[PDB]
DNA sequence: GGTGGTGTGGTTGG
């Protein structure tokens, strides 16, 4: 996350770090959904561009977590995977159009201050709060500036980050851009003008967009944390996998066995 | 199966359940209207 | 250390 700041304790207890078995890192985040059940983006699991393709095996989950790298002992919970779910229809070939895929886990996780799940949106929510000017949060792990290329500043953070951004104009989003935008895909990010900042960044893929519903004062997902060009430019806006019009899979998945 | 958790979905055990704000929730909320 | 270190608290033991 760029230009977010600490997260406090149990501010997102539904973040989920994804996490590779061999070597040992950090590859993503994701949210819990369920006791069972875990959201995330495809490419972070599958992309062929660049030669990945991982398998249940290869990741564990990391659940309760607010530091990086240390073990918090009696707080997180690590699961192993029982099966991987990625869209049928995730185009890695382009745009990633439908950048989403939920994880089983192996055995249901217990909750606590620190693991607790959020809630996915229905047709109510997405229409009252799916609006330019409305802002989200945003979570991760991921870089705090642009990595690939000298910059000053640590690359990543010791803690979990926020920002909370503001929802941008369809219109806007696809001028921004060469790459092909859907209406799976929605951006966020404050305007050149608008003088305040922040951003997801690489490593915060699979990470949730939540927004609070001032109706009944819960979380929801509307996002995952997709891509984006650079991380916090003037004039780009990063990109969010539409969580409610991917809807009717995450349920088809995630109801289908008892 | 979905299984556990629904009911109480979005509601954080630091937080809503104990009647607390985080620090920047209310910039949310105030983003929501206009 | 096992997982750092403004180390035996902390978001948790010893
Ligand atoms: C996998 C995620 O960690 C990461 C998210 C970066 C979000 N960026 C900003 N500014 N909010 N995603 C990526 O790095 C994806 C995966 C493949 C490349 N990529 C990109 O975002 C490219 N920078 C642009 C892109 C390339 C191909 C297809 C779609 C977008
Ligand atoms: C990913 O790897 C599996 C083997 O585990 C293979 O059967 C599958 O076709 C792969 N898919 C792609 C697009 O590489
Ligand atoms: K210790
Ligand atoms: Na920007």
């Given at each position: 996350?760029?230009?977010?700041?600490?997260?406090?304790?149990?501010?997102?207890?539904?973040?989920?770090?994804?996490?590779?078995?061999?070597?040992?890192?950090?590859?993503?985040?994701?949210?819990?959904?369920?006791?069972?059940?875990?959201?995330?983006?495809?490419?972070?699991?599958?992309?062929?561009?660049?030669?990945?393709?991982?398998?249940?095996?290869?990741?564990?989950?990391?659940?309760?977590?607010?530091?990086r790298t240390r073990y918090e002992r009696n707080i997180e919970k690590i699961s192993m995977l029982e099966k991987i779910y990625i869209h049928p229809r995730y185009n890695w070939r382009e745009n990633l159009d439908r950048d989403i895929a939920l994880m089983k886990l192996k055995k249901p996780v217990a909750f606590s201050d620190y693991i607790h799940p959020v809630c996915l949106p229905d047709r109510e929510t997405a229409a009252s709060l799916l609006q330019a000017g409305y802002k989200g949060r945003v979570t991760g792990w991921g870089n705090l500036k642009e990595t690939w290329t000298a910059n000053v500043g640590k690359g990543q953070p010791s803690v979990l980050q926020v920002v909370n951004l503001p929802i941008v104009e369809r219109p806007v989003c696809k001028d921004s851009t060469r790459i092909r935008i859907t209406d799976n895909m929605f951006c966020a990010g404050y305007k050149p003008d608008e003088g305040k900042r922040g951003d997801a960044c690489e490593g915060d893929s699979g990470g949730p967009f939540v927004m609070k519903s001032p109706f009944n004062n819960r979380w929801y997902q509307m996002g995952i944390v997709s891509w984006g060009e650079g991380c916090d430019r003037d004039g780009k806006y990063g990109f969010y996998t539409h969580v409610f019009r991917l809807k009717k899979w995450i349920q088809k998945v995630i109801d289908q066995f008892g | 199966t979905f299984g556990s958790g629904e009911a109480d979905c979005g509601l954080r055990p630091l937080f809503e359940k104990k009647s607390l704000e985080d620090k920047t929730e209310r910039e949310l909320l105030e983003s929501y209207i206009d």
């Open positions: 996350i760029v230009e977010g700041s600490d997260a406090e304790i149990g501010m997102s207890p539904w973040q989920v770090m994804l996490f590779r078995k061999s070597p040992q890192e950090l590859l993503c985040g994701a949210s819990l959904i369920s006791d069972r059940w875990v959201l995330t983006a495809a490419h972070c699991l599958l992309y062929p561009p660049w030669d990945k393709n991982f398998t249940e095996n290869d990741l564990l989950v990391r659940i309760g977590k607010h530091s | -």
